[PDB]
Amino acid sequence: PFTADKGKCGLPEIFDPPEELERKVWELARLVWQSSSVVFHTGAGISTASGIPDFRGPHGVWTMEERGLAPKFDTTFESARPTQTHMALVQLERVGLLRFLVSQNVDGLHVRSGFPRDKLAELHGNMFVEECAKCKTQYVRDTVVGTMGLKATGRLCTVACRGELRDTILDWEDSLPDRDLALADEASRNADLSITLGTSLQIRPSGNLPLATKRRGGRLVIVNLQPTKHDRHADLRIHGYVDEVMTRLMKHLGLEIPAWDGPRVLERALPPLPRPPTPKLE
Ligand SMILES: Nc1ncnc2c1ncn2[C@@H]1O[C@H](COP(=O)(O)OP(=O)(O)OC[C@H]2O[C@H](O)[C@H](O)[C@@H]2O)[C@@H](O)[C@H]1O
Ligand SMILES: Nc1ccc(S(=O)(=O)N2CCN(Cc3ccc(-c4ccccc4F)s3)CC2)cc1S(N)(=O)=O
Ligand SMILES: [Cl-]
Ligand SMILES: [Cl-]
Ligand SMILES: [Zn+2]
Numbered sequence: 001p002f003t004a005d006k007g008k009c010g011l012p013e014i015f016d017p018p019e020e021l022e023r024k025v026w027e028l029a030r031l032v033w034q035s036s037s038v039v040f041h042t043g044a045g046i047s048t049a050s051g052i053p054d055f056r057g058p059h060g061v062w063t064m065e066e067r068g069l070a071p072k073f074d075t076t077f078e079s080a081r082p083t084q085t086h087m088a089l090v091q092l093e094r095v096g097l098l099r100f101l102v103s104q105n106v107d108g109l110h111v112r113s114g115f116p117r118d119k120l121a122e123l124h125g126n127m128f129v130e131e132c133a134k135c136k137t138q139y140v141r142d143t144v145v146g147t148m149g150l151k152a153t154g155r156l157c158t159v160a161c162r163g164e165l166r167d168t169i170l171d172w173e174d175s176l177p178d179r180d181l182a183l184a185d186e187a188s189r190n191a192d193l194s195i196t197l198g199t200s201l202q203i204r205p206s207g208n209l210p211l212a213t214k215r216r217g218g219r220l221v222i223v224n225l226q227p228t229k230h231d232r233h234a235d236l237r238i239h240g241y242v243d244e245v246m247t248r249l250m251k252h253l254g255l256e257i258p259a260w261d262g263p264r265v266l267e268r269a270l271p272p273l274p275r276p277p278t279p280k281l282e
Contacts, residue, residue, distance in 0.1 A: 004172040007202035009056045010063040013225040014239035024238045025245055028195070029252035031219055031236070032097060033278050035193035040092075041210050042103040042110070045198015045224060046085045049243050051075030052107055056200050057226065077127055077144050082113035085197060087257045088246040090115050095255065095275035100187030104199060104206045106169055111140055113260065116269035121184035123176050123206045125168030130155065134163030140265045150174060176205065188212040195221045198242050201228040 016024060032038055044054035051074030054060045061071040075081075082090075090113050092098040102121045103110055108128040110120055122129070127144045130153050131137070137159050145153050149171040157163035170176065188194060194213035201207035201222070207229055210220055214233055222234040223245050231237055238245055250257055254276030 001172055006062040006065075007056060007200070009060060009066050010058055011056075011226045013058065014227070015225075016239045021238065021240050021244075022248070024236060025248040026252060027236055028221055028238065028245070028249055030281060031193055031221065032249070032253065033281060035191075035219070037099045037187075037191045038092075038097060038193045038195065039100045039102065039187045039191040039210075039213065040089055040098055041194060041196040041199060042085075042089075042101065042105060043197070043199025043201075044105060044107075045200075046083060046242055047080070047105060047107050047109055048198070049083045049085075049241070050080045050109065052077075052080060054198070056202070077107055078142075080107065080109060082109045082260055084243040084257055085246045086110065086113040086115075087260060088250050088255075089113070091250070091255055091258050092253075093119055093269065094273050096272040097253070097255075097275065099191065100183070102184040102188070102206075102209055104203065108144075111265060112263040114264045114266050116266045118268050121180040121187075122168070123180055123184060124170050125177070127167075127169065129168045130165040131168055132157040132159065132161060132163035133166055135159050135161050137161070137163075138168075139165065142263060145169075181205065184209055185212065189215070192218045193221070194218065195223065196228065197223050197246075199228065200224065200226055201230050 048054055053071040055062045064071045086109055100119055104124050106124050106127050108126050128141045130139050130145045145167045147153055147167045148169040150166050153165045155165040188209040189212045191213040194210040196210050214220055219235045221236040222228050223238045223242055
């Protein structure tokens, strides 16, 4: 916990030039069109444009620790708004173009964006979510649960139980939730397209799940400013700001990015909406 390996921190950013970027986002559009089963994998990089610093980027929580500096928040977790990328992923699921979303983010923002919980794996837990130790019932709070490390928050269960409520934030030693990880693994293995968004993929087993798509001929796309662990294994790497890549993709796919209504919780995916007809590819 003092000595916990924090991986490689503050590696240089790569920026694809605009023509190369435009050409790579079109090829990402082509792979989404061809894919039966698209799984998205998200890391702290999708929440940097909403004021929340990442871990290993130039101004990351671990990077600044290594240099004896403090990370800088431009928001509270509570006042944080989902990004363009968060709202793009909401819409891609609604029109049936995303099968499953796996996130390492504890920032609560996929849930607040209105993303269906039944298509989300929160591998490292959720700051707004507490769980009953007895009935395993989860509560999505409008404020951050004040503890970390699967501790007692001080509230009791209201299930028609008085079970002790605990946070969902894994400590370094704590293994991933069996339900979320099993569902993340399954969706990853069965995917023909895995797209990683603002993750450096350095955490096991979180960062290895996109590799499971590569078995039986699936395609891997990494979108990230820095190198990631699995750059070698990727069919397509896109070095740009994830908001720019996702707005450009959504425009190629015929899809508008929807308004955020403010914080809302959807437990179960609604029936799919109409989507644009597919272009002729080959
Ligand atoms: N706007 C942006 N657009 C694209 N990429 C970005 C952007 N901003 C940052 N990045 C990139 O996004 C990447 C973010 O990678 P990391 O910072 O390792 O976060 P994780 O989600 O992988 O951390 C996993 C766990 O490790 C921790 O201990 C916690 O337990 C976490 O849950 C960087 O390479 C940035 O270059
Ligand atoms: N970007 C960022 C920066 C800070 C926070 S946080 O202040 O809410 N807080 C959260 C817990 N960590 C400590 C950890 C303890 C155990 C860890 C761990 C669990 C499993 C597998 C590997 C692991 F390393 S990490 C400190 C920051 C949140 C984010 S966000 N947008 O949610 O990703
Ligand atoms: Cl904090
Ligand atoms: Cl819908
Ligand atoms: Zn209970």
